[PDB]
């Protein structure tokens, strides 16, 4: 495959986390999210009916998909992966399946995924899509309800405060997860990377059904290990996992998110953050320096691991200034 | 006067800075404001036509005047002073003089000063108004154009980038400044404090005209020294000025902002910030500890100086969590 | 005066009650207003913050001022009196004094009083204005707070639930009542009747100040007895008061609403309702018959008392069908 | 089947009629509907272009699906059946097939059926859907055009005033009826009851096609007799038909709406009203007492017939107070 | 077929061009279109991001489909063909495939194709649909990129200014062209004519796939020659081509637009304009006289060729007055 | 005076006509205005209720006051005069007196006069205001009702179709004309020219009262002869009046609009059009050539008459391309 050869040498990409959570920025009614601002809904058990009010404040006048891609491109990033739908269940694309999306429900009334797709295509960057296939806090049957003995960046993995009765992920799988994966893999042109996450609930068969649907719609799309149950083309390491020399040299619970796993094609990627948050967090100014970014990329890359470095856009659709400065500074260090 | 006796023993108040600048939060197009996020328009010479686009993003769904006043009251603050219009010229009340205001120009479509007024009244707090009488970057004849040999938190004191010709503050004084001062001193009930600022341009007679108008409309309102030209009832010290013991014990350019000045009624106030910014700034996490706040208040108060401590509300109308925590922590130190 | 001679022979007019209360139609959250639907805010102590939400639902697409005036005219009514502002304090005209009005605060965005004014003028009917000069539930200093030993159609005469502190009607008088009376007596052409109500609080001097302002702006406007303190040109009898023969034949607490009072010019008017409510009430189907309406009019008129017969428009701006049928039926009985 | 055993013992459910007709409440332009306010468009031959204007007034700020379900549940009702689309053709859910719906065409911009579905699920009530499969006054090929020798609550059964040419129900069946039945049986979770109506036009094969589609999408859904042509799992008796003892004891035109029909599974239901209208009607205050409701339910139930008792929500989305009072009163009579 | 016999005798129809281009009316930023005003995007290389702004100005309050069809009918026209989507790629109907359409993207929020379909049906006119299957300037893979050695009414046939990379029409064919053709041939009732255009890029197989889909959805639809590659039921002559007597008497590059081609069914049609533009152009006042129109129609018709005479609606949705006058004048010349 | 010396040498200015009439562009419901498109409301007796609908279509996305002024400046024009309110009574500025204005009543929600004022000031052009002091079709007492024996570009000079009763200009003078002249002469900075029109009704005293108000607010404003009754500082010739050499060389009904009148300060101006309409008219493509414009200007100027050359902006706020081309071409002919 072309995509396989390409990914092996790609080295460096940009990830984007952006959603209603970005407006709250890590705080809600005087209380804090963890370092995980995108988890605020679970962390503070914000009822859906309250969280939905954020749609009315979502008018990011400074969002510019071309300017974002241009930054990525100047830094030598070869691909961009963006959140189409995170755990809160809010879609950042025009979903016919679900009107809880950025196009229908906000005054912004624009398809953010569509604009980033088009921007990547003109600039020659490959395009990837993040989709939370398991957790969906907007759905009574969203995943996570079997996993609450394991600590999270929130409270429970599922929405356990609005939805307190019998739960069966199979229904959400059928009525929302699969139809939305169909939309994003159909309507945004060629997809090079599919970035799934926290496979806390879905079965082997469900992972497989997703894998086969993605391949039917996007034959060259490379699927990460967090689809779960070993149904994947490349290994995602843990959040900000930068392995020691020895571990990076050598390289299993298929549903854990940490550590190495087998990779028949020799493909690996660490997704990381510039500060310590995925979603934009007001409080978090612990931005890595140009030098650290440069060194992390060099280290990952020389052991054949791609560096997928995340930007959490703010409520106005901006790359934080300190993120842009860190990225452009790392670029300036490259001889 | 009752107001005079009250102010002398008031000790502690809350100041609020809030405006379009709060949405930008210290950055614009990848460049930084100084420590002064509310000066961003001058610091980066943002054309009015661009800055005005912020009105369309101004929908602060979490703004709650009662909850802000309640925090003030729990911390033992006896008065609240809010920005009705800062240097950028944007009014935070329904101005019939000028449609560049929060009621007419934004989807929020509410009178912020009106809501704060009513909240202070129900809670028994005294109400005060900040108004930038000299600088107004939305007006070709706004003040500051004689002062650009003095360094600022921005570039120029005036809007020198949209407006580059002959200037005469007398026109803005007549057509905007005085009619707006009339509005705010007529429509929001009893006003106990009038907080003017940076008298870089206005004449003795202009300062006097303001003083007399405020008194005609608000006989019990105390006017601060920054009205300029010696036309005042109490002395504002410098920004965050905490005077040494022997200066605080003893106590002249009437148009400078720093140091003591004469006060025939023995009234003084230092306005300070919890971090280092007046307006909300994402980048500023340098929040003073409860202990520092407590000690500053004790020191000012034992020399008969009031502590007016500022909160810069964020884009959603909220008291930053770290500000609320610092204030409640200082309160908890009053054993 | 022309107006004096005209009113004596006018015999029959239409009153209109219409406001936010008309949407609720006599119930709120499963609880009933009295027979007085327009008093629902007081009856159920609806916080202003909740009651104001009705502005969002106020889009009465079937309101037609010409059609309403035409009905009046076909029934032989010679004048129309409309609520410009009822006790809830919501203005049904474009008030620059207060944005709590039908033009600024609702999607309808139209001046109802302006449209009715123009309609009366084209059809040749005289125009009159109701204004609640004393009670204003939207104002902390609204009237009624001295009268709560007298039972009402609500709970208290004042808003005693949002505003629980010290009150002084003088402030509302100055800042809202008088400025709004100036607006309505300045902006809507010639006013023939001024209908004030429930003078529970205002002083002799305040009644006089109103009287003199109305005459300065509208020299020929006839003022009713409910301005209070004997400041009036004609006597309003009680709500639906149809006096016995011998009382009607011969004809004192100036601030009560019931019974005869002296009338230097020999002018009298009974305001009444077709059913038992002033504001539209879903529940009230006790519509008087054509015969009753005809007989009430004949009785009042033969003793030189005018009959001002009220329609409460529904939430879509319509004359209820049973009201229209009753009025046209009474008309048909006049030969 | 579980559903069969459940329905036999269910005894008591809530029906909801709600649409644009609810705003008019039984009147339009000074003319009356019959006791059937939901038939107003036919009764008064309101052109589609005029009737559609009601969408602009549809902002029911008091609609609260949780509170409606809670009332049902407290009265011991075990299921709730709601109008997804009545004869006027207006959908009360987000239909991709037709933008003439409450989500796309009104300022309310919400999926009413979706909110009721979610509320039923959290409370543990079963959910049922009414759909007018035959009559559709918004469609040129809507049913009814062969039936106009039979008297209606309106004028004609079809829209005969906008559409006066050759008609063929087969086209509406294919392009609107079947696609919409697919939507409502796909997107709102498990449906326990399907409530079809007035089978004036559809063929045996069309009834069968509907029956089979419902079963394919909702294997356990019980379908009522008004799907027509004998394609049903339970018998709906006539509107408010409370059968005499010996008829109720013993128990054929498959397309009539009155009387008993065979029921293989022994299932029966009478749908009734609290007053005399299905849709909200201002004029109709003829509310049955608690005692009548209790006695009707006891009578129906002791002959193994379910009582499906209708609420017609008003223009603001509320259960009329007198309806709520009647239902809570009947509940109170059950020791 | 019925349609074949009907078309042969139909003689005269109306064409409608209407879109965003109609607002610009032949000019943009002080530069001219060619008198093909609908080509202005290509002629002046207007970036999509700029051209899209026109959606915000699209509120044609005088559009009236019934009045347009009435005009057609009074002139004896037996069918109407309207632009569902022209070269700029903007849909004039509610497309679920693409939100760049008149319903979703403009304040008008109405389905223009839908309203015209309904109007034709009530008046008894046959309905036809224009769709640009090949050129689409809103799509990176839109057609025309192989044809830029042939001169156009614009610059390039494709959008070569926003999209400068690798291009493959197959992708647009699959993702936009075919799904939209399915929409228009499914949702707007019976279609008698399908009017395709400028087959610069699509293959024989693509033409065939379209032809077969149209026939599957619309078995009686007649397809014109500009579908290309010989896949058609009738011949469209060139733009405003009025053939000389001996060519009209006798009657091959299947993908050219000029001249005769074979027609097994003996069906032909010339589409023409009243002035010289398809889309509305301010500059074009060169309106043909009644006499010319009459003579063109008589000439075409006596050789068995239908005359499809275009109206370009203005930005308010109106038939230009001079167009209406020309058409009514031609009608009056038929004694 | 400085203004007098400046105007005498000014030579050349730009006039702007822009309003609701510009959208109709000379046509309404299939009928024509004369070559006076701004007169369409009178010409076709458009009821106010219908004409007001145009506000909903008024969203001129291409309006750019800086670019208009820059064109003026590049042509050597020294001043710009704009319609603040034409005969239709619609204000193009934010009027507190009357909400029938471009700020309050349209989605554009911008102060056109304000933007032009600011643009003139930055570019160094003097600013002037046109105001229809006599005719006002939106006011029952608007002028013209004494003049209907004199032919107009419309039907009657007044609105005689909505308002058919007793009329008295004195009321409109007091309640709209004078208050609005105060607004425009107070809120837009220094005004160099006041351009009044068609003094068909107002008295000498009324003319004088206007003159004296303008001078009180704008001491250096030059007032034209069409204020009427000899109350003026300079003479406006007739519309498009280019006097013969001998009349221009040596130079009375004070209320006629044609021919010379005395000018004690020697000031004269001809206002003309580039085509033959003041307001934008679709049909009017009779644009004068560069040569004609140049020769007109030279002729007027060498006899000491200023040339005030009008642009009628289109519905999108543009200078028509042919007008821009004519003006730039005339400029190019100046050696
Ligand atoms: C239960 C009833 O069913 C049909 O007979 C309708 O025509 C009614 O008006 C109502 O929805
Ligand atoms: C009928 C005409 O056909 C093609 O040749 C288009 O490119 C035209 O500009 C228009 O639609
Ligand atoms: C200069 C012209 O003046 C008058 O004659 C008006 O009636 C015209 O409409 C235009 O404003």
Author numbering:
A (entry chain B), B (entry chain E), C (entry chain F), D (entry chain D), E (entry chain C), F (entry chain A): 22 to 272, 279 to 362
Sentences from the paper on this structure:
Microbial α-l-fucosidases catalyse the hydrolysis of terminal α-l-fucosidic linkages and can perform transglycosylation reactions. In contrast, fucosidases from the GH29 family have been widely studied since 1970s9 and are reported to act on a broad range of substrates with hydrolysis proceeding via a retaining mechanism. The structural basis for the substrate specificity of GH29 fucosidase from Bifidobacterium asteroides towards α1,6 linkages and FA2G2 N-glycan was determined by X-ray crystallography and STD NMR. Here, we showed that BaGH2926A from B. asteroides, in cluster 26, exhibited α1,6 substrate specificity and could hydrolyse FA2G2 N-glycan through recognition of 6FN epitopes, as shown by STD NMR but could not release Fuc from N-glycan unlike GH29-BifC, indicating that GH29-BifC and GH29-BifD differ in their capacity to accommodate the reducing end of N-glycan.
It was only possible to grow diffracting crystals of BaGH2926A wild-type (WT) in the presence of 2’FL, resulting in a complex with Fuc bound in the active site while the nucleophile mutant BaGH2926AD128N was crystallised in an apo-form (Supplementary Data 1&2). BaGH2926A WT and mutant displayed a (α/β)8-fold, typical of GH29 enzymes. Asp218 was identified as the catalytic nucleophile based on its homology with other GH29 enzymes and proximity to the Fuc residue (2.9 Å from the ring oxygen of the bound sugar). We propose Asp260 as the putative acid/base residue based on its superimposition with Asp242 of AlfC26A from Lactobacillus casei W56, although this catalytic residue was not experimentally validated. Extensive hydrogen bonding interactions were observed between the active site and the bound sugar hydroxyl groups. The C6 methyl group sits in a hydrophobic pocket formed by Trp216 and Trp305. Unlike E1_101251B, which showed evidence of β-fucose bound, the electron density of the BaGH2926A complex most clearly matched α-Fuc. Compared to fucosidases E1_101251B from R. gnavus E1 and Blon_23361B from B. longum subsp. infantis, the BaGH2926A active site was shown to be constricted, which may contribute to the substrate specificity of this enzyme. From closer inspection of the active site, it is expected that BaGH2926A Ile284 would clash with substrates presenting α1,3/4 linkages, whereas the presence of an acidic residue in this position in Blon_23361B would create a stabilising hydrogen bond to the substrate.
